[PDB]
């Protein structure tokens, strides 16, 4: 059972992809559009390594969450998540600290 608000429901189903994955994803460009770093949004499912765009370009965040039904993604622009399911933005459950 999940809890707290920052912690999203599907956030526990995505497990924890490779941290560095969030680091290369933050490389600076969409992997399918090559648009830029700011306003990027890479998928964050237990098994979906790909850095999509944010409206900034075509927002793969939508068609990608729309095609793969993946709701959670992380904006390497501000460091938060986005559940196309809970349809909102969320940061690490904060339960952790000084990682
Ligand atoms: Zn969710
Ligand atoms: Zn995905
Ligand atoms: Zn894209």
């Amino acid at each position: 059972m999940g809890d707290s608000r920052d912690l999203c429901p599907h956030l526990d189903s995505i497990g924890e992809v490779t941290k560095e994955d969030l680091l290369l994803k933050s490389k600076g460009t969409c992997q399918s559009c090559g648009v830029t770093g700011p306003n990027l949004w890479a998928c964050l499912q237990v098994a979906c390594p790909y850095v999509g765009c944010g409206e900034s370009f075509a927002d793969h965040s939508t068609i990608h969450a729309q095609a793969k039904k993946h709701n959670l993604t992380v904006n390497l622009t501000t460091f938060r998540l986005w559940c196309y399911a809970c349809e909102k933005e969320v940061f690490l459950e904060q339960r952790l600290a000084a990682p």
Side-chain angles (χ1 to χ4, degrees), residues 14-26:
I14 54 164
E16 169 44 48
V17 70
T18 7
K19 32 244 70 75
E20 163 187 85
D21 204 347
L22 321 186
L23 305 190
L24 63 97
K25 282 162 168 249
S26 204

Side-chain angles (χ1 to χ4, degrees), residues 3-67:
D3 60 286
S4 106
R5 342 186 287 166
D6 206 52
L7 167 282
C8 129
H10 324 86
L11 194 160
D12 180 48
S13 190
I14 54 164
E16 169 44 48
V17 70
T18 7
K19 32 244 70 75
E20 163 187 85
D21 204 347
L22 321 186
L23 305 190
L24 63 97
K25 282 162 168 249
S26 204
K27 37 142 65 179
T29 9
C30 182
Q31 50 69 214
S32 286
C33 307
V35 305
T36 11
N39 223 331
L40 274 191
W41 304 75
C43 196
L44 192 86
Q45 321 253 131
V46 70
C48 197
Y50 293 109
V51 43
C53 20
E55 68 196 355
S56 252
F57 178 66
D59 174 83
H60 255 118
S61 210
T62 37
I63 47 165
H64 181 105
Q66 167 94 42

